[PDB]
Amino acid sequence: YSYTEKKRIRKDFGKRPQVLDVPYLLSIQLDSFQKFIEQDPEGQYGLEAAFRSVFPIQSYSGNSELQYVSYRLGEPVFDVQECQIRGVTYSAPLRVKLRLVIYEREAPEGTVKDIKEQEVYMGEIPLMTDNGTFVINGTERVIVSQLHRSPGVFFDSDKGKTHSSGKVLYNARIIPYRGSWLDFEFDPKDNLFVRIDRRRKLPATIILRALNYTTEQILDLFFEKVIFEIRDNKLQMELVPERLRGETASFDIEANGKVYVEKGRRITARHIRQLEKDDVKLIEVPVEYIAGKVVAKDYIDESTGELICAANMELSLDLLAKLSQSGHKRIETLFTNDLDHGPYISETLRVDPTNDRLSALVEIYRMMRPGEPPTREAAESLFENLFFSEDRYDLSAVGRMKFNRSLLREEIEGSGILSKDDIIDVMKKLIDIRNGKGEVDDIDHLGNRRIRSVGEMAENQFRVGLVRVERAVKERLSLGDLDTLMPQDMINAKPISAAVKEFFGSSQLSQFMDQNNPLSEITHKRRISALGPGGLTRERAGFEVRDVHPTHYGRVCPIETPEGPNIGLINSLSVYAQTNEYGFLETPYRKVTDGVVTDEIHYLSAIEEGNYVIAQANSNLDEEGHFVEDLVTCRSKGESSLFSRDQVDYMDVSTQQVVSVGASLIPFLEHDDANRALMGANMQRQAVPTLRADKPLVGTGMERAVAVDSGVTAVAKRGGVVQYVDASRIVIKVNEDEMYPGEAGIDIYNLTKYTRSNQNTCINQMPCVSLGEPVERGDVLADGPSTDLGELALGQNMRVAFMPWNGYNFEDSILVSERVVQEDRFTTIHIQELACVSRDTKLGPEEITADIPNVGEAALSKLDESGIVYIGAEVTGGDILVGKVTPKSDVKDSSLRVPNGVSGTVIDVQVFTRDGVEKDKRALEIEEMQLKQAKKDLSEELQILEAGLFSRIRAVLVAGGVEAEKLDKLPRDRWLELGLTDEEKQNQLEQLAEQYDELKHEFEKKLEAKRRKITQGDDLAPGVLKIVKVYLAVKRRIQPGDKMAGRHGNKGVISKINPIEDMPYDENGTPVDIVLNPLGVPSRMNIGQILETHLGMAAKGIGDKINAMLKQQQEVAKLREFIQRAYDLGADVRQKVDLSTFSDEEVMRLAENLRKGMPIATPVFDGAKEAEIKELLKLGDLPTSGQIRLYDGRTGEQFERPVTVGYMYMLKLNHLVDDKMHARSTGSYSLVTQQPLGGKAQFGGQRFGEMEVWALEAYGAAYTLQEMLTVKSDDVNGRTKMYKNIVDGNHQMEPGMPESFNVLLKEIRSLGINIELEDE
Amino acid sequence: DMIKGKQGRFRQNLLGKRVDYSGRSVITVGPYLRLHQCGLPKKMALELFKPFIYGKLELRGLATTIKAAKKMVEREEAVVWDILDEVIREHPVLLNRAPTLHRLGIQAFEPVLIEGKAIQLHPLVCAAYNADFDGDQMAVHVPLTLEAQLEARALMMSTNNILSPANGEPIIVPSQDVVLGLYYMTRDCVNAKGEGMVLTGPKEAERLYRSGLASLHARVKVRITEYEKDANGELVAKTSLKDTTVGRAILWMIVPKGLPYSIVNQALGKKAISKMLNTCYRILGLKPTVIFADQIMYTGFAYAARSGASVGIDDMVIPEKKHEIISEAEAEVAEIQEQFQSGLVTAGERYNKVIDIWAAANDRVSKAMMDNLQTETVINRDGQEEKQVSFNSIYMMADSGARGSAAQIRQLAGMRGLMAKPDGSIIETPITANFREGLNVLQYFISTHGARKGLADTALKTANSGYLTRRLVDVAQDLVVTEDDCGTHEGIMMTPVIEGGDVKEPLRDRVLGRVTAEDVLKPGTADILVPRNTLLHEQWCDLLEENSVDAVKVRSVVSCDTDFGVCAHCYGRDLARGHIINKGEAIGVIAAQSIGEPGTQLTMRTFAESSIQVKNKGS
DNA sequence: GGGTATTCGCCGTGTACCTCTCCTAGCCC
RNA sequence: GCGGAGAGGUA
């Protein structure tokens, strides 16, 4: 095992062997943004694509072209940490290489001038941190992936609710990634209408007209021709027999001398076979049959020239006669089979008012730009740019892939723009489905839903910025002179940076990282939101989209989704799933070669999954990849059933791949109802880091994956040996293997101590390792918030007993023992930030001095001369954090004070001054604190490099005459001034002296740079001189009213803290910590907590046994025997830990770590069965039934019917009563409607809403409602008179009229409506 | 836009204001409370009652001027807490829970100052509030004026609202721990400690139980003196020997005077306790019912704690014959599928057959599990053995009506039935596993679909119901009981709704509390049974049950003659109180609230006709 | 012209509460 | 620093 694993091994249950290890969990964000930057030649996804899409920018025929070579991302000026500290966006300057070329005005095009620009600057692009977040204003943001309809063509049905007369009317919608939408829909009367993206519905054929297709061409392209020959008389038809399928006979179908189909009998299959084998081609037909058909071509009179019948004209006897006399032997009619082949395009052509191409373009223009007279070239240009301009209309690689796959063409790679064959094929498939030889698509299929991650959205926003600046430059290059300007006055960065900063800062999908728990962070980054741009709104969304689809299997978590209003629209991504090249979702599966289940893994998307029969992971495989059962359980078309051994194409990788990380963390998920599992995961993401997080006694094994993959731990990059350990930094000397040959040095990890997370929780790292321990690459050096030795420790595991204890755990409420507060185990540190800003007013700049009008010296006592609190001072609500004076000059103070009712210690103060004033005290202390540390780090590195150089000088000095007596006793610095015999050796000494100088000079420039960065004014908003930020840290202890939860969906409010003596206790005398209500189990079918309690009791019992054997310190042999018997525990387990291989010191350290209880690992669905828990309980010498007899701590009497006790892992959620609790008597009121403010930040009153009003009306409660309506909130005179009256000790009151009503009157009167309060 | 719409105006700022002297905090159990009180944090109470504090401080002279009173409150010295205790004494506060569905969403309580930052809510009232101690919060308002105080204490106080305004039934019924404790206490066991000993009264029953010389439930003959008010309000003691358990006597200690012993003699589950409270109210009145409810809570909590009821994995017993039932159903499905592949039966017929056989197997396994779990305690008397209704903790929680129904027990220990796919069609193979066992990926996934669909439904339904109830309260707001009696003869003919098989709803509740339009006659003419319009209270309704009246014409609000409102008589009695409606009451809002609360509440709760078969012997 | 369908467009879509960022705009001297 | 958008969460 590895070193962090050898420290504390976790007993892992679980029978099937993990073939695929959990991937890097943040792969989504990192890989997408990497694709975004990715200097790459061939334009694929990536900033490169945006540039090549928008450039080259040619003038409005001015013959001055602009070309793009390549771009480079500048090095960020500010690293992540300082950028967060200073409240700026963490970003890189973006530089792009351009050339302006001016070809000769009147010559074959050749540049008369080409000028190359020196890497022009087009704005700042925020960079993503190592962990996958963005620092946008000193706040860590996450860009959530977005699920949305993929570009392409989709054929929907939208039936049932269609005019309530049946008439299922189909529609084909063509959606591009960039460009206007196309829509073809039907109508009750089976007429096919086109609707440009979202306008009125025109007859579809106009678009066919716009494509330069003539009516005859259309009827050719769509309908199957029918030939009518006239030979010596009366209309004989060339007939293809197979066309007759399903047709009542209208005439007598005789052929070759024999009547085959009698007139009136529908043609039967017998007749079909007869006629086919007989080879009947042509049959004479009565004129009544033709009296109804439609004509394909436009038959003109060849003799005189006058047209007679036009393309798509209904035939009448008179027209047939005219045709026969004109001399037309061959008549081309249409095949309209009302069953299969309908007259859809025909009827649209009849309704279609437009005839020529020009009229169609005119109608299009009058739809797009209604009311202005259309000019020919205007319509031509509009329509061309609409769907066929590469620049304006682009589908995608993905859009084209979906388009070609939908229309069953082998070719996958196409052109972005919609070619005409595309549109015609789409309409053909639509009418095809309308006949009924095809299915409509379901939008909810993940094969129809594509994921846009961060980099893609950023690319879109950047392209938009480019199109803005492009229009601008176009105009400026046309109007302005051509040859004078160089290519940097011409290009403006403002629109680019505006669009990019708009997306990253002010966007729906760019939201704060939910940063109070490591799980919270990691799950926030791997999220798939169906909202945002071009996304359905959460409130509007119908159930069908929200409902889980069989396609989500192994792609999206079915159980983890907010239970709020946007349920189902959030859908956290599953464990193993990834994004395709085209942005779809694929999940791993193990290939199955007909008999053996091989080990090569293939990632399958939704469509590919649809075809095959996939076997489940929890399928029994024996030693050679063969299924133990003859009929195994698989799924083929989204439905599971039994298939034979030699039929399964694939198999699930592992049981966990169905569920997200949050859900994968819940033990015994298989025993929890889905609802309560949902709530469990959602809450578990809300747990607050306690002071010392420990570990789950009952985990799932995913804890290490989550902790490591989140950025909260400090992890070794190059393995080595720990050289220095401090509670601020871990310094490791690298191993020679991994040691770089040239300019290697050592590795230094600076840790982060109490800092403020987004949610005001603490982010503190503790060292795991000790001096001299060897570490390997990828081990956990330092524990982040709520993580221990590499494992996720969301909360803490305490001894619970399921019983009702005098109704203090009545409802989901929880009883807790005072021992929990005594051991100080649910006390969290929180951290508030406060800011005092001194701006520049026109009456004079405000000052931060400590001289503050009419404040007692009591308030100043804790303030320094500069007027800022001392670091470490304990403050309370209302104390003055910093001194400020408002200019009038003083007599008034705008000094920041601690908010009311919050009290903690000032741990840190920061000062940011644009003025860069010479003499600010706090600035001096903070600068010295940062500087001395920086100096120490640079000094350490320099000293190591100097020791190496001195060693090299000794290694050269030893050659050419050994001198060891004199040398070793004089100091080392007295070795450069010494000399040697003139040779090459002196040249080497000169080399090393110049290298010494070079190391000095590099140190000096690095130091100068760091000191310039520290000193510089930290760029503030216009008008603001300087800002002072103060961090308070507060230790919040658990108290009645706080919310606690388990991992299984059980919740509760801490109802009472009991003394230790009152709490139930076992025979041995150990009291329980929490007394949890049993009645929450049966109706809320979360059984996972009960099994967790049993297994936790087993694990803590074993841990107790190891503590007992260790406290008496028997001998290594006993410990090894017991721990080995424990780790083995039966068979079929994939552990097989060998205690013997580990050294006795490592085994002693492992026993020390296991003394608190041996940690178990039950995977979610491949979990621990009851019998194994029973065995583990027996090994610990505990009751096999998992219930114990308990004695009442108050009475001392035994409880009848023993109760379940055991350790369960509980969490303290961020819902803290002291944060929730709030009251006001009187305070500030609002401006327009004189009601008191709403909220907690400003005192704020509760909202007596209309439902509450109704409640009061239901009672006869007229006076309570009256005062509540006027005196309590809205009536100004009433409220002040009532305050005075109450103070006077009388409770009478006058009601008056609410001010809000007067505001209403004034506002209605502000319309043209006179509304008066009458009097008589 | 400012006027129209929800967020803008009338709704927002003119019917939905934001009061002063109000607070909010998390709610907590506080079992020790009286029904008419609530635990209120010291600091919140001080903040709310600030101006009262100033007034009282100035009256006693502890502060010269108002600013000194403010400074003294802001230091919070002992005198301030004494003044707070004195002012808070009789001052009642209003407690409200965010979805004020019906008028019981706001109730008045007398506060008791406590440490901590959470409001303590009496358990019994949670049902009225739909309150749960899982992070629910409540707001607390302070009635300021003298008139507000009288209204809160008289009309709105918790103890005055024990009957729901919607239907006459009690609202404050014990919920889960109380009923579990009471059930455990009253159920008997064939053989225990102190079997068959004769006790002189309940007092020595408790002597025996608390000293451990007798089990809390053990069959015994006890002498008890019950009181019955048969005369004109006088109580007559009858004292005899009944055969009961120790526990039933211990419970009998609390029971107020007027009630028959029989009431407690049974198993005493949810229904039994609710009807106990009901009878106590109808016979004795309000105040005894209040005190008796508090006593019920205390004894239930106490003896639930003494019981030590828990839930272990082995407490839910897998029926021994489950595997056989499942294998049989699988063999049958295999046979029917093979007989399908040959093509003698369509797909729909096979679907129906499979679904029906699986349903039958599910019912079979469920019944087998319930038989196994239900009556499994085969404990021995002196000699031979016997069998009785088990003491399985999950079974007592099910049967008592504390938590869970037979269905959830099935989902725990049986097979968790059939599921519905998105479109509503039912999967052919069911989920054979249960939560005691482990589901597998497919079965879990399916149940996930179920749960997700339910949660989405609840949210959509909640919005639709909130709209519907808003419309209702809006339309009927102006309707008030304005006149005492309009004097019309009109009325509606009320019958018992006999839908098909049997009597879904009997006459007595359908007619209870309505005044009659005209006298109804016995089966023999000129035998008037009920005078001209009389309010039909329980006694008249029971009398009608004794006779065989089938249909009764009762005055209805719709036919009421009164202009601009309704008259008391046309409406009837039903209220949180028992008497005829009082002139002035806003019946429109109560009706609208009572009709809308269930619809929203029920969505949260969710989270052939070939031959006729006469059920009873008749013409 | 008069009645019947059919399209068309407006109005509504539960409460209470708690965190965070961001706010008139654009260009040149 | 009254407001209003967007995001998330609680019951």
Place this chain on the structure above:
DNA sequence: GGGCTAATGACGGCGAATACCC
């Protein structure tokens, strides 16, 4: 930094405004 000017992913219900059939 300061001063001046001017697009597409709801749905139902209901009642009015044409489409059309005599």
